[PDB]
Amino acid sequence: AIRFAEESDLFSAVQLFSFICQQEKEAISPDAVKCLAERVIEGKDLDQETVSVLCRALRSIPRPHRPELLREIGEMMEFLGGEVKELLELPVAKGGLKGDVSAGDIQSFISKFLSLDGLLPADHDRPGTYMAAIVACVDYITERLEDIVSDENPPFSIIPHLLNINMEETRRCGQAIIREAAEQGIHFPTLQVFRFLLALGDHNMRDQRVYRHLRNEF
Amino acid sequence: NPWNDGDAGWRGAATGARANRGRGGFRRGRQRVQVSGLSDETTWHTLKDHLRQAGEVTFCKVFSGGRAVVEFVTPEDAARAITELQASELEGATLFLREDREDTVLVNTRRKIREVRDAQLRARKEE
Amino acid sequence: HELVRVLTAFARAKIVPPKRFLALLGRRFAVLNKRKKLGSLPSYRAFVNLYKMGHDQMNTFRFLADCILETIDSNIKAEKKRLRLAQLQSDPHLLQNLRARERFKRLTELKPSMFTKLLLVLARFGAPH
Amino acid sequence: KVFKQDRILKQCLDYLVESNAAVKLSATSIGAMLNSLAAIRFTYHRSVKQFMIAISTEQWSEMDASPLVKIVSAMAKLSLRLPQVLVHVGDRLLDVYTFLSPLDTALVINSLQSIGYGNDEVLMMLMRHAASSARRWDEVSLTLLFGASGVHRLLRNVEVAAPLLEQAAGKTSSPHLRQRIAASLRRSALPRALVQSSTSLLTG
Is the dihedral of CA D80, D83, D85, D89 positive or negative? Predict the structure, then answer.
C-alpha cells in the first residue's frame, strides 16, 4: 500500500479500498489504508453508483478499527459530501439526480448517504459539506414530495434514517412526508402505524393534521 | 378475509406477549365425531388425551358450550369410538357423542341410491 | 370527475380492464382529491364500478368508503355548527317521513336503498364495525 | 454444546441481579434460564440463591403452571432448598393444580420429594389429582412418579393409591421398575390384603 499512493489509478485505488474494507478483522492494518485515504480523496467526476460503493466501503470499517481512522473518515466524508452536492444539481443527461423520475432510485442513494452519519462519535462535530449535503437532500425531497409518495413503491423506508439524524431540519422533512401521506389517505400495515406512532411519541412533534390520521389508523 | 389482505396484525406480530407461549427452550439460538357437554376450560390437549383411549386423532377443535369436532386417523379408530366412549366421565364434563353419518363425500354417495330408486319409482308409477 | 367519467364509460362498454391500470387510477384519485373534494355520488359511482368488474385491491375501495364517510361527517358537523350558532344568538305518516327523507338526501346525497347496500358490502368485506 | 465455563456465566448472573433486572423479566424467560443453568451443574450456588431471592411476591401470584413446573424442576435438579420460596410455591399451587397435565403432576411430585418439602396436605391433594386422571397416565409419568425418592410416604390412603396401581401394572414393562415398586409397597399403611394382591401381579 505504500507505493500505490502514486503507482495506482483512481478506479483501481477505490476498488482496492473496497476490497480491503470488506475483509475480516484478523487481517486488517490501519497504516495500509491510511495511504489509500489520501490517494482516493482526489477525484473529479465519479458515477453515482460508484460513489455509493465508496459510501458502502466507508460503512464496512470494523468497529474497533473505526476510532483509529477517524481523520481519514472525516476526509472521505468531506470528499463524498462535495461530490454529492455537485451531483444533485446535475441533469439526468449526465446522470444527475435532479432529472430523476422514480422513487426507488433516489431512496437507494439518500438512504446510504444518510446512514453514512453513524461513523463519527456523538462528542464530535460533522463536516460542513456533509451538513450542507443533508440540507441539499432535504431541499431536493421537499421540492418534489408529491411524486415520490404517489409511486407504487412509497419511500417510507427512508423515514427512520432522517429521524436517526440529530439534525432537527431533517425531522421537518420526515414529518412532511407522513403529512402528505395523511393528506393522501394511504393505508399502512399495523406494525408500520405503531412504529410511526412511537416515532411521534419520542420526538414529540405537534402537528395536528397527521394527529387525526394517526388516531383513525390506530 | 379480504379486508385483512394478508396483514398478519398483532396476532402474528412479535410482541413480548407472544414469545411467552414459546416454551420450546430457546436452544438453537435464532366420519368426524361431534362431542358435546364439555367445559370451555377443557383444553384440546385434554380432549386428545381422553378420546385417544378409543382411537387416534388427526384434528380436533372445541367450540363455545363444549361442542367440538374430532377427525379420526382410520375408520377403525371411529367404529370403536362411536359406541365406546359414550357418556364417559371427564373433569365433571360427561360427554355426549353424535356422529355425522352423512359426509361431504357420503352425500354424493347417497345421490345415486336416491336417483336409481327414483327411476324405479317412476317405472312403478308409469305401470 | 374526468377519471370517474372514464370509469363509467369503460363500464358502459363492458370491457375486460387491465386491473393494474384501474388500481393505478384509484391511487391517483386520492392525488387529485386534494385539489377538489370528490362528491359522495361520484365516489359511490366509482365504488359500484370497481365492484362490478372484479377489482380486488381493497385500498381503492377503502379510499372511496372513507371519502363517503368524510362527506357525511362534514355535512353533519356543518349542521351542528349551524345549530350551535343559532344557540349563540340567545296521511300523517307521510307527513313525518318527508322530513326524514329530505334530511337523509340533504346529508348523504344518496337514497337509503343504496346506502343499505354500501353497508352490506362493507359488512361483506369484514371491516371493523 | 455442554460447554462448562462457569467462570463466564457467573459474570452474566451477577449482572442480572446487580441492575435489579431480575424482577421485571418474563416468567417463561426465567423458567428457561434456570432450567438451562440446571443442565451443566452450575457451581456458584450463592449467586443463583441471590437471584432467586430478588423476585417479589407479585410475580409468584399469577404465574402460569407451565413455567412454574420448570422453575421447581430447575430448583430441584440444582439441589436447592430455599425456605421462603417453597411456601410461595405451595400456596400458589392451590389455585392451579387442576390445570396441571398428568406429566406435570408426575414431575411436580418427585421434584418436591427430592427437595425435602414436608407440607403433607399439598402433596396429598396432588396425589388425589393424579389418581383422578389415572386412566390418562402413560409410562413416562409412571416412571417419574413411582421412581421418586421416598414415595412410600405418598402411598398413604387406600383410595388415593389403588386408582393408579392397576395402570402401573398394565402399562410399565421394565422389570427393574416392577421390582422397585414391589419393594416400595411393603413400607406403607396399605392393608395386607391389598399389598399382597398388588404384589401378586406387580412382581415380574
Answer: positive
> Quick one: closest CA in D to B28, which residue?
D1
Contact assessment for residue A163 and residue A199, using Cβ atoms and an 8 Å cutoff:
yes
In angstroms, the CA A75 to CA A120 distance is 12
Question: Angle, to 10 degrees, between the axis of helix C40-52 and the axis of helix C112-125?
Answer: 50
Q: Are D30 and D71 in contact (CB under 8 A)?
A: yes
Cβ proximity of B93 and B66 under 8 Å: yes
Q: Would you call B2 and C126 a contact, using CB atoms and an 8 Å cutoff?
A: yes
Do residues A76 and A39 make contact, with C-beta atoms less than 8 angstroms apart? no
According to DSSP, the β-strands at B57-62 and B96-99 are unpaired
Please name the helix (run of DSSP H) or strand (run of DSSP E) that holds residue C26, with its range, or none: helix C19-33
Residue C29 and residue A184 in contact, taking contact as beta carbons nearer than 8 Å:
no
Residue of A156, A208, A218 lying closest to A183 (CA atoms): A208
Strands B68-72 and B96-99: unpaired
Nearest to A165 by CA among A109, A106, A115: A115
Looking at beta carbons, which residues of chain B come within 8 Å of C58? 2-3, 5
B chain contacts of residue D70, beta-carbon cutoff 8 Å: 23
Cell triple for B90: 371427564
Which residues of chain C make contact with A184, given a CB cutoff of 8 A? 30-31, 34
Beta bridge partners of B34: B69, B98
Beta strand spans in A87-152 (E):
none
What sections of A151-217 are H helices per DSSP? 159-164, 168-184, 190-203, 209-217
Which residue is listed with cell 396401581?
A: D165
CB nearest C63 (choices: A150, A183, A185): A185
Give chain D as a DSSP string.
Answer: -----HHHHHHHHHHHHHTT-SSSS-HHHHHHHHHHHTTTT---HHHHHHHHHHS-HHHHTS--HHHHHHHHHHHHHTT---HHHHHHHHHHHHHHGGG--HHHHHHHHHHHHTTT---HHHHHHHHHHHHHTGGG--HHHHHHHHTSTTGGGG--SSTTTHHHHHHHHHH---HHHHHHHHHHHTTSSS-HHHHHHHHHHH--
Residue for grid cell 423515514: A159
Instruction: Tell me if chain C has a CB within 8 Å of the CB of B2.
Output: yes
How many Å lie between the alpha carbon of B98 and the closest alpha carbon of chain D?
23
Q: What is the resolution of this structure in A?
A: 3.7
Contact between D164 and D155 (Cβ < 8 Å): no
User: Does the distance separating the beta carbons of B5 and C126 come in below 8 Å?
Assistant: no
Q: Is B6 on the interface with A (CB under 8 A)?
A: no
CB atoms within 10 A of CB A213: 20
Q: Among B80, B51, B56, which Cα is nearest to B68's?
A: B51
